Structure formats: structure tokens, C-alpha cells
């Protein structure tokens, strides 16, 4: 489900 | 007068029913044989019978 | 972070 390139700390 | 006699009746605008248009195949069917060049050079003995 | 349905849910603040 997660697109971790759309991630942020 | 002579060259109107060449055409005959002038074809109508856009109709392929009672009378044909100037670009219709059905109207062009007799003139295409007149305007073809092998009508003169291809046949070897012409037929004079109205077939 | 966005899921496949188009609705967007995000975490707040997390460090590693």
C-alpha cells in the first residue's frame, strides 16, 4: 500500500 | 453548339438516383471507354457491330 | 505517503 518514495521523516 | 452536342445533357449536382452526378462511377461508365488510350492501340481489328 | 486508492493519509513525525 505504501509508496515509501513518498516518505518523510 | 457542337461542343454542347459533345456533352449532351449536363449532369446534376449530387445525386446517384434518377440521374447521376459528374463524379459518379455510374455516369462515368460510358465515357471511360472513350477516354482510354488502349481503346485505340490495344485492339488489333476493330469491331463495327453495335454490341 | 499515499495509498493506491488516491486517499492520502500521513504520519505526523517519526525519526530513526
Amino acid at each position: 500500500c505504501v509508496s515509501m518514495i513518498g516518505g518523510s521523516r | 453548339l457542337v461542343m454542347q452536342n459533345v456533352i449532351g445533357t449536363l449532369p446534376p449536382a449530387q445525386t446517384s438516383g434518377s440521374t447521376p452526378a459528374f463524379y459518379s462511377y455510374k455516369y462515368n461508365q460510358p465515357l471511360i471507354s472513350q477516354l482510354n488510350s488502349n481503346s485505340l492501340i490495344a485492339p488489333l481489328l476493330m469491331d463495327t457491330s453495335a454490341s | 505517503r499515499v495509498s493506491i486508492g488516491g486517499t492520502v493519509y500521513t504520519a505526523k513525525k517519526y525519526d530513526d
Partner: protein, 52 residues
């Protein structure tokens, strides 16, 4: 063989020769036959029975 499929294109040597002979004869530029409006007007002008 198969040439680029963009419009008229030949598929064989004979087809290339035929495409040449068409293209030198320049039927690809056909003559411009009359316009519908002007021709229609001069047609019903020249076909109609005079003085009626």
C-alpha cells in the same frame, strides 16, 4: 518486406514499380473539380427551361 505504414506504401518490388508509375504520372495530384456552391448555381442556371 513492409515499408513504413504512413500512408501509401509498397510491399514488394512490383509494388515499388507500381508506386513509381503512379507517382510519375502524378495522379496523386488530381485536378480540382468545381466547388459545390458555384457549380450548383451555374448548373441550375444552365439546366432550367428558359423563359419560364
Amino acid at each position: 518486406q513492409s515499408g513504413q505504414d504512413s500512408g501509401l506504401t509498397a510491399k514488394s518490388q512490383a509494388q515499388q514499380a507500381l508506386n513509381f508509375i503512379r507517382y510519375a504520372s502524378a495522379q496523386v495530384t488530381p485536378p480540382s473539380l468545381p466547388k459545390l456552391s458555384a457549380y450548383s448555381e451555374l448548373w441550375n442556371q444552365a439546366t432550367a427551361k428558359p423563359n419560364s
